Design a protein around this nucleic acid. Structure first.
Ligand SMILES: [Mg+2]
Ligand SMILES: [Mg+2]
Ligand SMILES: [Mg+2]
Ligand SMILES: [Mg+2]
Ligand SMILES: [Mg+2]
Ligand SMILES: [Mg+2]
Ligand SMILES: [Mg+2]
Ligand SMILES: [Mg+2]
Ligand SMILES: [Mg+2]
Ligand SMILES: [Mg+2]
Ligand SMILES: [Mg+2]
Ligand SMILES: [Mg+2]
Ligand SMILES: [Mg+2]
Ligand SMILES: [Mg+2]
Ligand SMILES: [Mg+2]
Ligand SMILES: [Mg+2]
Ligand SMILES: [Mg+2]
Ligand SMILES: [Mg+2]
Ligand SMILES: [Mg+2]
Ligand SMILES: [Mg+2]
Ligand SMILES: [Mg+2]
Ligand SMILES: [Mg+2]
Ligand SMILES: [Mg+2]
Ligand SMILES: [Mg+2]
Ligand SMILES: [Mg+2]
Ligand SMILES: [Mg+2]
Lengths: 96, 53, 89, 107, 168, 57
RNA sequence: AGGGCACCACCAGGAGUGGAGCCUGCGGCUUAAUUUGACUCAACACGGGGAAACUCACCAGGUCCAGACACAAUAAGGAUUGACAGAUUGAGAGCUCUUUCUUGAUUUUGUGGGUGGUGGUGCAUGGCCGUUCUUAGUUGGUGGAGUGAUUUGUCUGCUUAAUUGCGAUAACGAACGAGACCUUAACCUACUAAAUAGUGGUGCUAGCAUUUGCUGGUUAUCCACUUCUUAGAGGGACUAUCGGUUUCAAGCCGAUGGAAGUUUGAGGCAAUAACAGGUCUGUGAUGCCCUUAGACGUUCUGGGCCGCACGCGCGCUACACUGACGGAGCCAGCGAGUCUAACCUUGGCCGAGAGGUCUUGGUAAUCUUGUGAAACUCCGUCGUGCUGGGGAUAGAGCAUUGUAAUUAUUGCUCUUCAACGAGGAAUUCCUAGUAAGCGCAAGUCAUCAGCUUGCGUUGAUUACGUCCCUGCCCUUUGUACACACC
C-alpha cells in the first residue's frame, strides 16, 4: 500500500548513509531503531529493494540483517540525487 | 492510526517467545535465556551448558 | 420466541438421570489396535524400486575402479594447492 | 600519586577454572613482588547452573532427561595498593573468558 | 551494568551462540570455522576463524566494515566499541566445520558423493589426522533414504577423549 | 467505493469578475491548512486543530 | 533342541496399584468446536501439553495485505489514501453506506513470478530422540580350510558387570565397543588462605543468674588460628594384607586393617547394524503437493480444548489407637531472585484468616535464609463409634492475580460430612542410606501442582540364588524364507 515519500527517503538515505540496516522479525513495532519510521516500513522497503537486486538479506535468529550491494548504491545516487561518485556510502568514508 | 489491531501481550505464553525460532511452547526462561527446549539442546555447548552427569 | 439458555432449563431428556437410563454402546470399549501397522514392512505403495534409480544416484559397485582413483587425485591436488597457498610466491 | 593504600578488591568470575586460577595466580605473583599486603584468592562456592530438558523434541519414547551444567567459579583478591602503578599493571593483559571487576572502598 | 553473574555469563554465552550461527550463515562460502569473543573493558574484539580470509576482508575494508556495522547495530554496541578481526584456520584439514562446509560446496556444485567424501576423507588423512569418518544421509535420485559411512583411519567413540580429540 | 473525484475547478468561492469586484465570503479564520473543510449537516470536518476546536458552522 | 542373562523376570520378601472418592491423560459419547500428534513392552501427569485472553492449531463472526518484482492500461483534468458524526457492528473496525473534505507515480486493475501457512505427506527426507541394548557385541592384518560364497581367529570349559580374562587352540598378534576416561559423593586435625565461612581468646565491652555458666556485640571502633565450611593443588584404594577354594590359574569368599573392599556408590560417554519407532505441529530444516484476499496468511471479539450414560492408564486422599487433634519441642539439603525494573522479601503496623500498608536488605557464600520445611518427639484431649477417621459434594461471605475469574483460577472463615471397615481376576517397582513414609526448591508461572526433575529428613523386611514364568542373547539342527513368517 501507500508508504509515503518522506518515509521511503528516510529509509533510503540511511541505507546510503550506513550501508547496512538491521531490523527485527516483529511487525507492529511501528518505530525502527535509528530511523524515524515504522518497522513495517523498513522491512518492506528493503524486501522491495532485495527483489530488484540492490540489497542482500540475512535472517539469523529473528533479526533481518540487510547488506547493500554495489548495484544498489548506484541506484541510490540517481534516486537521492547526490554528487556523482564522490560520496561512496559509507563503508570507505571516514577512516578509509 | 489503526486502533483495532492489538491486544495485551504482557503475561503468559504469548507474551514471550524463543529468540531463535519464535516458538511459544517449551520455552526455557531460566537465567534469561528465552530459548525453547529444542533450540537449547542444539545450542547447549556453545552457550556453555555442557553435560557432565 | 424462547431459545437458548431459557429453553435449556425446560428441555426434557437433558440431565444425568435421563442419560443414566440409556445403556452404554460398545464403541466405548474399543481401541485403535495398532493403527494399521501390521503390514509396515510390506509396503502399501508398491514400487519395488528399480536398480537404475538406486545405482545412478547412490553409487554403483561396478564403477569403483573409477570412483576412488579420481577422489585420490583431487584430494592430493587439494593438498597440492593447500601447501602451494601456504607461503609460496 | 605517592604510595598510598587504596583498599581495592579484584573479583574474578569465570566458567573455566584453569584460566581463572591463572589470573588469580598472577594477581598473587604481582602483589608478592611489589610487597603489597593482600587477602588472597578467596574461593567462593562454585555456582552450578543445571537445566533439565526432555531428550526428545516431540513427546515420544521413554521419559529421558539431560542435565546441562554450567559451572561458575569465582574468586576475589583483596588488595591495599598504590593505585597508579598497580592500575598500570592490572588493566594490561585482560584475560578473555575471565571477567574481572575492580572495586575500591572507603574503609 | 547491574546484572547477576548467573545472568551475565549466560547472556554472554548467548551472544556467542548467536554470532556462531550468524557467521555460519553469512560467512558460509568463505570457510568460517569458529568465532572467538574476548570480553575486555573499553572494547570487545571479534576474532573470525575464516580459512579464506582475503575475501572476508573484501577489498579496502569492505565486508569487514559491513560486519562491523552489522554486529554493532543488532547488539547495539556503541560506534567503535566493537571491532572484528579475521585470522585464518591453520591445520585446515583437521577441522570438521571447515570440512563440512567444503563437502557442502562439493555436493551443491554438482559432484558425486563418493568422489566428494573420499575427497575430504583422504584430505584429512593427508593433512595429518588419526581418523576420519564422513556420514552422508538423505535421498539422491532414489526415494528411499540410505546412509553410508566413509571411514578411514582410527576413531574412539566412548568417553571423555571424544571431547578431547574429536571435531564433529 | 471511494470518491468519484469530479474534475473540479476551485470551489466554495463565488466568483472574481462579476460586477465588479471580488465576491468571496467567509472572512479569514485561524485554520491555516481561511479554508473550507467538509460541511455535511451543520457540522464541519475537523482535521487540523489537535486539541481544541470550538466552532460549529 | 541345548546353554546362558536380567527384581523393565522369578525366588524370599517389602511397598503397592487394580476395589472407594477426587486429580489428570487416553478412547468413546456429545457438540459449532470439544484442534491434534502418539496405541504392547517402546501410546495414555507423554508433546516439557498445570490451555480464562494470548498460546491455538478448533468453532461462530469482523478487519487488514504485511499480493516482493517485471510488463500493459488507468493519472497529475488526480492512479490512489485517511477520515468528523449518523446508520451499521460486540466493537470507541470510515468494515460498508450518507456527506465532502483530505491526499498525491507510495498505489489500483490483470498476466507471470513470489511471499506466508501449527495445512498434507515421518511411507520423500535431514537433524534430534526412543527401542534392540546398557546388551556385549563388531572388524581388519598375515597364516590355515574351501573352486567359491565364506570360514578359523571372534572358542569346548572356568570366571566377569563385560568377547572380562584365564585357558584350549590352525592360529598368531591387534583395533572399535566393555574398561580406561570425565563428572559427582564419601577421607585429608598435611599444604594455600579467607569480615562474602567459621573457631578461640580478648584487644574492647556490655547483660543475666552469679563467683563462672549462658550470652549479646566492634576486625587502621582488635589479635590469632583453620578443626568445622569453602575450593585450588595434591595424596588415598590397588579388592591392601592374611587365610580358604580354584586347573594353585583367572578369580571368588571370609577375616583384619582402612574414609571407602557391591565397577568404592552413582551417573555422563557409549561401537557395528538397524526399525518403514516418533517428530513436517520445535525452527527462516527441507522436497513435493494444497491455499494465497470470500485465505488454510495475519489479527480482533466471544466460545472450545475442561463439555459427559461410560471403558482404561499414571496418581493424590483414606479405611484410623503404630492413629487424628491441640499445645510444646524443634532439626536439613538442591535451587532462584529486581533497575539490561518491579523479582526473592526480612522487620514494624492493621486483620481470625487470607491478605493489606510503611519501610528495608539483596544483581546474591554478603539479603531473604539457620529457607526455625514436613514426617518425627513429649504432654494433654479422643477412645474402636463410619468416630473428633475420611473430606467428596454443596451453600454463604472476604481477599489475591489478571483488561477480564461465569463453566466455581487460587487462598481464606463458617456450614454440608458422601463412599471408603485394607480391596476380586490380575498386576507394578525394588537388594542399603536402597524400598517406603515425609516434606523443600526448581520447571512451566501474572494466578493455578494431586505433575515432573532434583534435594535432604526418617529408614526397615528379604536374597546374595535361579532358569520356574516372561523377555533377550549365543550355539546346534531344519528351511522350498532373502519385500527375509508382516
Ligand atoms: Mg509445542
Ligand atoms: Mg580405527
Ligand atoms: Mg576404547
Ligand atoms: Mg566406559
Ligand atoms: Mg515374589
Ligand atoms: Mg483407583
Ligand atoms: Mg476431548
Ligand atoms: Mg501422522
Ligand atoms: Mg505435566
Ligand atoms: Mg482468539
Ligand atoms: Mg512453517
Ligand atoms: Mg495458523
Ligand atoms: Mg580377520
Ligand atoms: Mg584372510
Ligand atoms: Mg567368524
Ligand atoms: Mg579444612
Ligand atoms: Mg518411520
Ligand atoms: Mg511409520
Ligand atoms: Mg492482523
Ligand atoms: Mg487437553
Ligand atoms: Mg499414563
Ligand atoms: Mg502432632
Ligand atoms: Mg541450612
Ligand atoms: Mg464424621
Ligand atoms: Mg489454567
Ligand atoms: Mg511451583
Amino acid at each position: 500500500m501507500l508508504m509515503p515519500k518522506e518515509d521511503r527517503n528516510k529509509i533510503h538515505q540511511y541505507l546510503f548513509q550506513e550501508g547496512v540496516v538491521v531490523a527485527k522479525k516483529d511487525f507492529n513495532q511501528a518505530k525502527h531503531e535509528e530511523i524515524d519510521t515504522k518497522n513495517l516500513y523498513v522491512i518492506k522497503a528493503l524486501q522491495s529493494l532485495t527483489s530488484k537486486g540492490y540489497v542482500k538479506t540475512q535472517f539469523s535468529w529473528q533479526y533481518y540483517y540487510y547488506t547493500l550491494t554495489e548495484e544498489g548504491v548506484e541506484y541510490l545516487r540517481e534516486y537521492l540525487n547526490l554528487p556523482e561518485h564522490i560520496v561512496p556510502g559509507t563503508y570507505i568514508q571516514e577512516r578509509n | 492510526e489503526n486502533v483495532w489491531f492489538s491486544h495485551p501481550r504482557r503475561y503468559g505464553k504469548g507474551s514471550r517467545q524463543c529468540r531463535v525460532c519464535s516458538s511459544h511452547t517449551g520455552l526455557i526462561r531460566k537465567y534469561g535465556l528465552n530459548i525453547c527446549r529444542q533450540c537449547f539442546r542444539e545450542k547447549a555447548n556453545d552457550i556453555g551448558f555442557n553435560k557432565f552427569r | 420466541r424462547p431459545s437458548g439458555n431459557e429453553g435449556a432449563i425446560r428441555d426434557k431428556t437433558a440431565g444425568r438421570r435421563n442419560n443414566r437410563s440409556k445403556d452404554v454402546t460398545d464403541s466405548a470399549t474399543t481401541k485403535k489396535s495398532n493403527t494399521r501397522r501390521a503390514t509396515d514392512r510390506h509396503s502399501r505403495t508398491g514400487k519395488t524400486d528399480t536398480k537404475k534409480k538406486v545405482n545412478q544416484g547412490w553409487g554403483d559397485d561396478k564403477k569403483e575402479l573409477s570412483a576412488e582413483k579420481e577422489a585420490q587425485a583431487d584430494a592430493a591436488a587439494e593438498i597440492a594447492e593447500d601447501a602451494a597457498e601456504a607461503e609460496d610466491a | 600519586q605517592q604510595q598510598q593504600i587504596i583498599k581495592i578488591r579484584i573479583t574474578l568470575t569465570s566458567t573455566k577454572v584453569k584460566q581463572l586460577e591463572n589470573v588469580s595466580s598472577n594477581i598473587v605473583k604481582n602483589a608478592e613482588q611489589h610487597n603489597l599486603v593482600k587477602k588472597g584468592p578467596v574461593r567462593l562456592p562454585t555456582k552450578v547452573l543445571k537445566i533439565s530438558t526432555r531428550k526428545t523434541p516431540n513427546g515420544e519414547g521413554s521419559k529421558t532427561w539431560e542435565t546441562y551444567e554450567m559451572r561458575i567459579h569465582k574468586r576475589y583478591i583483596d588488595l591495599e595498593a598504590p593505585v597508579q602503578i598497580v592500575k598500570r599493571i592490572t588493566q594490561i593483559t585482560i584475560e578473555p573468558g575471565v571477567d574481572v571487576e575492580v572495586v575500591v572502598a572507603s574503609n | 551494568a547491574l546484572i547477576s553473574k548467573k545472568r551475565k555469563l549466560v547472556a554472554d554465552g548467548v551472544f556467542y551462540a548467536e554470532l556462531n550461527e550468524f557467521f555460519t550463515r553469512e560467512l558460509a562460502e568463505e570457510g568460517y570455522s569458529g568465532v572467538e569473543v574476548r570480553v575486555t573493558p573499553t572494547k570487545t574484539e571479534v576474532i573470525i576463524r575464516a580459512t579464506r580470509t582475503q575475501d572476508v576482508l573484501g577489498e579496502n575494508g569492505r565486508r569487514i566494515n559491513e560486519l562491523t556495522l552489522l554486529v554493532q547495530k543488532r547488539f547495539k554496541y556503541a560506534p567503535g566499541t566493537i571491532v572484528l578481526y579475521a585470522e585464518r584456520v591453520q591445520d585446515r584439514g583437521l577441522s570438521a566445520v571447515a570440512q563440512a562446509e567444503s563437502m557442502k560446496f562439493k555436493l551443491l556444485n554438482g559432484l558425486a558423493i563418493r568422489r566428494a567424501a573420499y575427497g575430504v576423507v583422504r584430505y584429512v588423512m593427508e593433512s595429518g589426522a588419526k581418523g576420519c569418518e564422513v556420514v552422508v544421509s538423505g535421498k539422491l535420485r532414489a526415494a528411499r533414504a540410505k546412509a553410508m559411512k566413509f571411514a578411514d583411519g582410527f576413531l574412539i567413540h566412548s568417553g571423555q577423549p571424544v571431547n578431547d580429540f574429536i571435531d564433529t | 467505493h471511494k470518491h468519484k473525484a469530479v474534475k473540479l475547478a476551485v470551489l466554495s468561492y463565488y466568483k472574481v469578475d462579476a460586477e465588479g469586484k471580488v465576491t468571496k465570503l467567509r472572512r479569514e479564520c485561524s485554520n491555516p491548512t481561511g479554508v473550507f473543510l467538509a460541511n455535511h449537516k451543520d457540522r464541519l470536518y475537523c482535521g487540523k486543530c489537535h486539541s481544541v476546536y470550538k466552532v460549529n458552522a
